[PDB]
A paper describes a structure:
In order to elucidate their role in the lytic cassette of B. subtilis prophages, we cloned and produced XepA from the PBSX prophage and YomS from the SPβ prophage. The putative lysins XepA and YomS align very well, with a sequence identity of 38% (54% similarity) covering 85% of the overall sequence. The C-terminal disc of XepA is very similar to the structure of YomS, and the full-length protein including both domains is essential for cytotoxic activity. Both the XepA and YomS monomeric β-sandwiches adopt a fold resembling the C2 domain, which usually contains about 110 amino acids and 2–3 Ca2+ ions. In summary, we show that XepA initiates cell death in vivo, whereas YomS has no effect.
However, YomS corresponds to the C-terminal half of XepA. The three-dimensional structure of YomS was determined to a resolution of 1.3 Å by SeMet SAD phasing. YomS adopts an antiparallel β-sandwich fold, which arranges as a pentameric disc similar to the C-terminal domain of XepA. In this disc the monomers can be superimposed on each other with an r.m.s.d. of 0.1–0.2 Å. Comparing YomS with the C-terminal domain of XepA shows that the structures are highly conserved, as presented in Fig. 7. The individual interfaces within the pentamers of both proteins show extensive electrostatic interactions. The buried surfaces between two XepA chains and two YomS chains amount to approximately 3300 and 1100 Å2, respectively. Rather than being based on one or two key residues, the interfaces are mainly held together by a large number of hydrogen bonds (over 40 for XepA and approximately 20 for YomS) and salt bridges. YomS does not exhibit any effects on the tested bacteria. However, the XepA C-terminal domain and YomS may bind to the capsid in a vertex position according to their fivefold symmetry, stabilizing the virus particle (YomS) and helping the virus particle to escape (XepA).
Residue numbers in the entry:
A (entry chain B), B (entry chain C), C (entry chain A), D (entry chain D), E (entry chain E): 7 to 118
Amino acid sequence: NVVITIPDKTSFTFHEAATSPSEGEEFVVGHFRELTVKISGSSTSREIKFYAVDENGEKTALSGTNKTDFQLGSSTLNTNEYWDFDIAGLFKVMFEVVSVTGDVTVKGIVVS
Amino acid sequence: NVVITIPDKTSFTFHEAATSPSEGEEFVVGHFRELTVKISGSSTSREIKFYAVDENGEKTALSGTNKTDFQLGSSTLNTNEYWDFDIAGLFKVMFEVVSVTGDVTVKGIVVS
Amino acid sequence: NVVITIPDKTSFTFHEAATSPSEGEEFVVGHFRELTVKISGSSTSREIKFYAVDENGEKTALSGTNKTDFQLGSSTLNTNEYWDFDIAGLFKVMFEVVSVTGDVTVKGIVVS
Amino acid sequence: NVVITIPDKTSFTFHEAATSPSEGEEFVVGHFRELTVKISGSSTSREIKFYAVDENGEKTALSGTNKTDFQLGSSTLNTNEYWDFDIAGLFKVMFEVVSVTGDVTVKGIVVS
Amino acid sequence: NVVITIPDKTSFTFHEAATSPSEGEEFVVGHFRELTVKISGSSTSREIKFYAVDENGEKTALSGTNKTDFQLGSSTLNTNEYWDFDIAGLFKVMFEVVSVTGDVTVKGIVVS
């Protein structure tokens, strides 16, 4: 029995147009394996910190890979970036806006 | 229950025989995970820039891997090359012909 | 025949609030491929050693990847960390509390 | 609904007992993802060049990984070697015997 | 149509209690992708060489990754070690006991 395999995917908004600091919305990983976050908006400065969160709400800095230059990091000071993360073994993920001047949007696509 | 698994694949033409600068056709990623782009044609010079595009049309430089030498890059000045990309968490991808003297074809095979 | 594929996942507690040295509970890998361990609690100091265990009970130091900084290691002196392991070819895994001052929890999520 | 997943595999002969230069047979990749080539025989010298080939017949040097030493390359002067390739995004692959003294066999196993 | 995916696994004994030099038993890869070999026993010295074997019985040194320290190698002088191999494109694999004083067991778990 041969089957053609495709992943499940969904979208999630962590921040829809943050203009002040916030932890934003937390994604429950469920059955997904990978996350790509897009950082967008018209800010002139910002800092986003990337976090894994467990069932008790403890936050742990989470490294991912920048799709522009393959750099590794657990935060960014830039906008117009995609960051890839391996999330399969995590309960929840969170993308904190530490600081922003203007507006920053943080949205993800998750893949099983 | 044991199943033999195979990927879904399709072909996509970004540029059929570009002779002038163009963003070309955008590929909506859908359920796919990986893309291999072939840059072909007959040219003296050409420049192809690789982009991810979000739902608002923002373009982000996208790095891939050259199958000939495993070099990383988000653009190329060469023809007769395959470039591999991880696209699973992206909305769309675009391969811009910034310039061509002669003609350049840009075609992909996508894999789930 | 097209199928959407998702992994199996489960959770496992190696140590539910260790305050003295212990090997803790051993996880039978079964059909799983990957493990992510979270080291948590309010301990002021601890040492966790990571082990693969075979069917005869022989323990072998097992390296994994720290999700905060991508560092490799077979042990840690830190709390609030995730460690990723490729376990597909192992019979059992074990996370030994070698030492602790305070309480340390060791819990994993496994993925097929 | 839980399924046990296994790949499709097949074998392909690029060269059965080449004693003079030849492009040999081309493999149409179809639904396969990976290729491992064995270079065998009693030749005393040879040069094999590894190619991806598109729908127009353009040949592109294709790097793979030597399973003995993890070296990368797009050709070999050696015999008794396995080379692994990621082929999922390619139309065809070809292994050219550029030169040979004696007999060289080039056979692959492909995996979905 | 959504399915939860798990691998096929199997076990294989290359050597059950080798006390003198032997090539041991050959595993036919079949539909499997990844192999983890455990080297165990009470030997005080030993040398194990790792091989791929083709349909004609030709042996090729095969590199794998030590799970304790991520070191690469095609042989070992140590006991109490796991070695991981990518075997998907191989016909057969063999683990030769070149020498041993005492007993060495060589067993694998294989994953699709």
